Structure 1
Amino acid sequence: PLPTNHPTQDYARLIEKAAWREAIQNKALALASSRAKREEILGIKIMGKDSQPTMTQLGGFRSVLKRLHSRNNRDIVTGYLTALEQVSNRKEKWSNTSQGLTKIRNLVTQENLIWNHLDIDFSPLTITQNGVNQLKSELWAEAVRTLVDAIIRGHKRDLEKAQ
């Protein structure tokens, strides 16, 4: 690694972020490709003609998730889900998912869990001292947005095959 005080460390930081961003986009799209993986991560699945939940319910959540610019914004997403969970009819819309409301809450709250799912060896994609922790804390908000967006989009394709 570079010493943190090495003059070019600021320049290396630009390279690190660009390489991480593309790797995250790829690996999220890899996991979105599997109909088991969407069920593991969010609990969305296809059952006969239907999707659980309905696409509109994903679209609603997707519209909120774009407000997750920074980790402190986990308030907003947690605020949404608790407001969702309080309305019984809307809560049961997420029945027949795999625990989906809890899975989303975990992914939005547990700082580790996004990286555990994506499971990227960042070691070949980093060169700065402590770059891994600096970049994980940096990119967390974008990793979440990238993964959920990929899953919802990829799920829609498999719905069309079944529909």
Structure 2
Amino acid sequence: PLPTNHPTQDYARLIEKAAWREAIQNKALALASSRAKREEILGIKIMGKDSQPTMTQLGGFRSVLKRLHSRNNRDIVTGYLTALEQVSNRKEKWSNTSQGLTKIRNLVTQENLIWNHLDIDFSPLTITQNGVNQLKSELWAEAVRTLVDAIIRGHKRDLEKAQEN
């Protein structure tokens, strides 16, 4: 790895983000391609024709996650989840998920957890010393958004195979 003071450290860091971003994206595709991995990460599942929760409830969450630009915005998503949880009829909309409301709470509030789900080995993808710690602190919110977007797309397109018969 480059010495931290090295003059090409700035340029190298542009190469790193690119390699990390595209790695996160490709892994999010793979993880979203299986229904067991979608249920593990968000609790989202198919029950015959039915989606747990309905796609409208996933769209509501996904519309709030668009506001997760940084970890200073995780209060926005935790605001949404507490409001959802505080309304009994909306909470019940998420029963028969595999604990999906708390899985969302965790992913938004445990910074390591997106990386645990992605489980990318970033060593082939970093060259700056302290590259992994800084890029994880930098790309966290984008990784969360990227994984949930992929999961919800793979969910809906597996739902279409069960629903459109």
Calculate the TM-score normalised by the size of structure 1.
0.99
Give the structure 2 partner of residue 13 of structure 1.
13
- Between the aligned partners of 1:17 and 1:49, the Cα distance in structure 2 is 40
Q: Deviations over 1:17-41 (max 9, x none)?
A: 0000000000001000001110000
Q: Quote how far apart the aligned CAs of 1:71 are.
A: 0.7
- Secondary structure of 2:46's partner? strand
- Between the aligned partners of 1:114 and 1:48, the Cα distance in structure 2 is 29
- Secondary structure of 1:112's partner? helix
- Between the aligned partners of 1:48 and 1:131, the Cα distance in structure 2 is 44
1:6-155 paired onto structure 2 within 5 Å: 6-155=6-155
- Between the aligned partners of 1:3 and 1:42, the Cα distance in structure 2 is 39
- Between the aligned partners of 1:82 and 1:150, the Cα distance in structure 2 is 24
Q: Quote how far apart the aligned CAs of 1:50 are.
A: 0.3
**Which 4+ stretches in 1 moved above 4 angstroms?**
none
Q: Quote how far apart the aligned CAs of 1:140 are.
A: 0.1
Instruction: Mark the runs of 5 or more structure 1 residues left unpaired by the alignment.
Output: none
Calculate the TM-score normalised by the size of structure 2.
0.98
- Work out the number of aligned pairs and report it: 163
Q: Deviations over 1:121-144 (max 9, x none)?
A: 000000001000010000000000
Q: Deviations over 1:75-111 (max 9, x none)?
A: 0000000011000000000000000000000000001
Instruction: Mark the runs of 5 or more structure 2 residues left unpaired by the alignment.
Output: none
- Between the aligned partners of 2:22 and 2:162, the Cα distance in structure 1 is 30
- Between the aligned partners of 2:131 and 2:65, the Cα distance in structure 1 is 26
Q: Quote how far apart the aligned CAs of 1:152 are.
A: 0.2
- Between the aligned partners of 1:22 and 1:48, the Cα distance in structure 2 is 33
Q: Quote how far apart the aligned CAs of 1:48 are.
A: 1.2
Q: Deviations over 1:49-93 (max 9, x none)?
A: 100000000001111100000111000000000011000000000
Q: Quote how far apart the aligned CAs of 1:5 are.
A: 0.5
- Between the aligned partners of 1:104 and 1:130, the Cα distance in structure 2 is 29
- Between the aligned partners of 1:36 and 1:2, the Cα distance in structure 2 is 39
Aligned-residue sequence identity (percent) comes to 100
What is the aligned-residue RMSD (CA, Å)? 0.4
- Between the aligned partners of 1:25 and 1:111, the Cα distance in structure 2 is 18
